[PDB]
Amino acid sequence: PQITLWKRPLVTIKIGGQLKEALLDTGADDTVLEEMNLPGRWKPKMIGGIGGFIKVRQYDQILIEICGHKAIGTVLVGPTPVNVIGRNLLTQIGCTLNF
Amino acid sequence: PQITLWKRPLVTIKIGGQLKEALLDTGADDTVLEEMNLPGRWKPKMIGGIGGFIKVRQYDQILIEICGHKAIGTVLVGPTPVNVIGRNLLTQIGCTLNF
Ligand SMILES: CCOP(=O)(COc1ccc(C[C@H](NC(=O)O[C@H]2CO[C@H]3OCC[C@H]32)[C@H](O)CN(CC(C)C)S(=O)(=O)c2ccc3c(c2)OCO3)cc1)OCC
Numbered sequence: 001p002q003i004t005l006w007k008r009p010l011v012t013i014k015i016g017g018q019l020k021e022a023l024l025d026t027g028a029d030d031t032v033l034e035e036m037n038l039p040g041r042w043k044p045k046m047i048g049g050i051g052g053f054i055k056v057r058q059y060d061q062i063l064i065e066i067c068g069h070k071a072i073g074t075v076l077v078g079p080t081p082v083n084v085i086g087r088n089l090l091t092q093i094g095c096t097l098n099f
Numbered sequence: 100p101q102i103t104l105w106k107r108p109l110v111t112i113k114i115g116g117q118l119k120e121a122l123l124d125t126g127a128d129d130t131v132l133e134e135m136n137l138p139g140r141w142k143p144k145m146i147g148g149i150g151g152f153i154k155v156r157q158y159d160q161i162l163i164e165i166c167g168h169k170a171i172g173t174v175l176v177g178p179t180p181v182n183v184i185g186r187n188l189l190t191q192i193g194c195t196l197n198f
Binding site: 084 | 100102166
C-alpha cells in the first residue's frame with residue numbers, strides 16, 4: 001500500500017506468534033522492539049540512538065510479518081521508546097520512499 | 100524520485116543558505132539538525148529516542164529545500180549524532196512509504 005506521513009506510520013506486526021504495533025522507521029538501520037519474550041538463542045549487543053547506547057538481545061533469523069508481508073531477519077529486543085521496524089526488514093518487504 | 104532502502108536514505112538539503120546532508124526519516128516526528136547558527140528567536144526543547152534525551156533549540160517557520168522541493172516548518176537544532184528530516188517536513192514534499 002501507499003502510506004502517507006501525517007500520522008505516525010504504525011502497523012501491526014506478528015512476531016513469536018503475537019501481534020504488536022510498530023513504527024516503520026527509515027532512519028533506523030536495525031529493528032528494535034520493546035522488552036518481550038522471544039524463543040530462540042540470542043547474543044548480547046549494543047546499539048546507539050539519538051541519546052546514546054543501549055543494551056539489547058540480538059535474535060537472528062526471526063520470522064516477522066509486517067502488514068501481512070513476511071520477513072526473516074535480525075530483531076533486537078531492548079529498552080527502546082517504541083517498537084521500530086528498520087531498513088533490515090523494510091528492504092525485505094519491498095519498501096521504498098517516493099516523492 | 101524513488102529511494103530504495105538498501106543504504107541510508109541520505110539527501111542534500113539547503114537550510115539557512117547552506118548545504119547539508121540529512122536522512123529522510125519516517126520514524127522522526129520532528130526535524131533535527133546538527134548545531135548551526137540560525138538567526139531569529141528559538142525555544143528550548145528536549146527530544147528523546149533510543150539511549151535517552153538531548154537538548155535542542157526549536158526554530159519555527161524555517162525554509163528547507165530537499166532535493167528540489169521546498170518546505171517550511173519547525174527545525175530543531177542541537178548536538179544530534181545525525182541530521183534527520185522528520186514527518187513535519189516530509190509530508191510537505193509529498194513523501195510516502197510504498198510496499
Ligand atoms: C553517527 C552515528 O551515531 P550513533 O550510532 C546513532 O546515530 C543515529 C542514527 C539515526 C537516528 C534516527 C532514529 N533511528 C534510530 O534510533 O536507529 C537505531 C536502530 O538502527 C540503528 O540505526 C540508526 C541508529 C540505530 C529514528 O529514525 C528516529 N528516532 C525516533 C525513533 C522512534 C527511535 S530519534 O532520532 O530518537 C528522533 C528524531 C526526531 C524527533 C524525536 C526522536 O522525538 C521528537 O522528534 C538516531 C541516531 O550513536 C549514538 C551515540
